[PDB]
Amino acid sequence: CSCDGDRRVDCSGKGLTAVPEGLSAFTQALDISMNNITQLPEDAFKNFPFLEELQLAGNDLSFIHPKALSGLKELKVLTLQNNQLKTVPSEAIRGLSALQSLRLDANHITSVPEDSFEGLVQLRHLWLDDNSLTEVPVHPLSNLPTLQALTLALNKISSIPDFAFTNLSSLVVLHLHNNKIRSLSQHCFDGLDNLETLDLNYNNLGEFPQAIKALPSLKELGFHSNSISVIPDGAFDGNPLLRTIHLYDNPLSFVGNSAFHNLSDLHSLVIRGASMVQQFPNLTGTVHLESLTLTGTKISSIPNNLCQEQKMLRTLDLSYNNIRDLPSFNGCHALEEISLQRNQIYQIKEGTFQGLISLRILDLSRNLIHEIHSRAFATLGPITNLDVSFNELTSFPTEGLNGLNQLKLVGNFKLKEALAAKDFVNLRSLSVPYAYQCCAFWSQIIIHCTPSTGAFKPCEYLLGSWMIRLTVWFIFLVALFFNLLVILTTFASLPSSKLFIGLISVSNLFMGIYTGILTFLDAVSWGRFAEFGIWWETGSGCKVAGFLAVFSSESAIFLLMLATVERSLSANHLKQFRVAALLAFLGATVAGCFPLFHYSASPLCLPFPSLGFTVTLVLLNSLAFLLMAVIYTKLYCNLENSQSSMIKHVAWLIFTNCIFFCPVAFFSFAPLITAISISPEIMKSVTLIFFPLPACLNPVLYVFFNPKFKEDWKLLKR
């Protein structure tokens, strides 16, 4: 073993097969812990008259001979942790007259015989932890008049009967954690007037052990993680000196109104899950509380005298409640943990928070406060975290909120006005319903907004740089006029294949209007977009631009779907095509209202970055081109003019439409398949120019490559 020089024998870590021999008579401590001795011969430690500290822990004793442990009349602590003794060696510990602590704990004690613990009059600390005691050894425990600290924990006892603790008149510790006592009688705990700490946690008592009324000196009462669910009124009248209570993680349904009154020394109060509680408890006499974590209750109003009496308050957690009206918190000079969340509070007045010089946590989230007074926060001091997120706010007061270390406002969807950056100078973390707000909050300090602002939801410039700004503008001028060139052309002179080539221009013309609306919004909102973006994205302006954005794209493909079908007649049907052409327009306006019915991905308002319309369009426009190509693969099955001229135009209207929409799609097919090698700016530029570009060369294709326009421009002018 190893061993230290205080006249102490401590034989640990050797696995000795017997009692060590040849040891001194003056050894103040005989420790033989952590070896493999199974039993002791009679008078095994007789050679050692002057013992004070016996430590035979972890030796795994099985059977103690009747006279084996005798010969020790003056040891202070006897310790046999990690043992396998079935019964307490009472026939051997009867001579333990000068004991100070019998650590019988961590043993296999299943039952203590009736003639036990006799002579143990000087003992102070009794330990039967980690054992299998089916019941309190009352009669053996009756022989312990001066025992100070007893631990009956980790045992197999189911209940404590009457007069089970009377003789323990000096007991100050009662540890029963990880035990299974389910009941106790009224007089059972009588006689423990010297008790200071009572442990009943990690247990299964289904009712409040009200028998604690005979514990006037009790100060620590821990029964948390129990089966207790009801709290009878006046459960602590007999415990005026109690200072702490452990009752967390319990099926607490109802708590008495006056059950928490006259606790002058109480320093904490946590009540989570008390659904049946409807009113604030009576806190009279408890002027020394630090926290009331009253969560999971149904209280409707906080009394106005709350901290007119709780002058020493620090924490107020009333979340998961039905609080509607907040009283004045004046006088709460030491309160720093207001967390009134998940409540029904609808308004904050100027005097609601006045007088909170020490408040540092504000958690007014998940509430219904539609309006907050401008001077409501003007009195507060060093508030670090204000979380008002997920509310119904329309205007956010800003006076006195300079030092907000962290701010949370997400979910206030009607907070249209963007918060200024001058009245939140000392801000580090922010969260606002619309990213435009944070774009404004970002000389300054490192800010950590999380609406995820970026290129898709632009802060300053809608369309990338001046390059994309002009090409889209270039598209608009070409798409608006060259189509109106075709609109006046083919409908101011209709052979259907020359009607469709004209009806496609109608659909593309609204694309020019959409990209004209897009370039007009950017032009007016040049140099800034937060001021106009919120009014644009949320307002009806996006819907009008959004309707034309997809209606033009769908109808152009839908009409071009009919165009190749009409031109496939070369391989009578004019009547069925005029109505079908209107059906394509009618079938596109329904695919233009799905946004409008049932985008806030961009101000571009397109539906393409909602795995609804997006997938159902890119899998229908691509399948459109698939059918639209296999049909035209057949037109050339042909192993002549005025219809071959129509063949080339539709073929070139096929080739250009499938390239452009192909890009917009792969990229609008989303990075779902693979997110690597993407750019929320470069890829939004290409989906910004190459989406309406197919409806930009359609009018300067028909006008230039196919001769019917030359035969129609003459027809108008002459």
Curated annotation (Swiss-Prot):
Keyword vocabulary terms for this entry: Biological rhythms, Cell membrane, Developmental protein, Differentiation, Disulfide bond, G-protein coupled receptor, Glycoprotein, Immunity, Innate immunity, Leucine-rich repeat, Membrane, Osteoporosis, Phosphoprotein, Receptor, Repeat, Signal, Spermatogenesis, Transducer, Transmembrane, Transmembrane helix, Wnt signaling pathway
Listed transmembrane segments: 472-492, 500-520, 545-565, 577-597, 611-631, 658-678, 685-705
Annotated Gene Ontology cellular component terms: plasma membrane
Subcellular location: Cell membrane
Membrane topology, as annotated: Multi-pass membrane protein
Role played: Receptor for R-spondins that potentiates the canonical Wnt signaling pathway and is involved in the formation of various organs. Upon binding to R-spondins (RSPO1, RSPO2, RSPO3 or RSPO4), associates with phosphorylated LRP6 and frizzled receptors that are activated by extracellular Wnt receptors, triggering the canonical Wnt signaling pathway to increase expression of target genes. In contrast to classical G-protein coupled receptors, does not activate heterotrimeric G-proteins to transduce the signal.
Official protein name in the record: Leucine-rich repeat-containing G-protein coupled receptor 4
Gene name linked to the record: LGR4
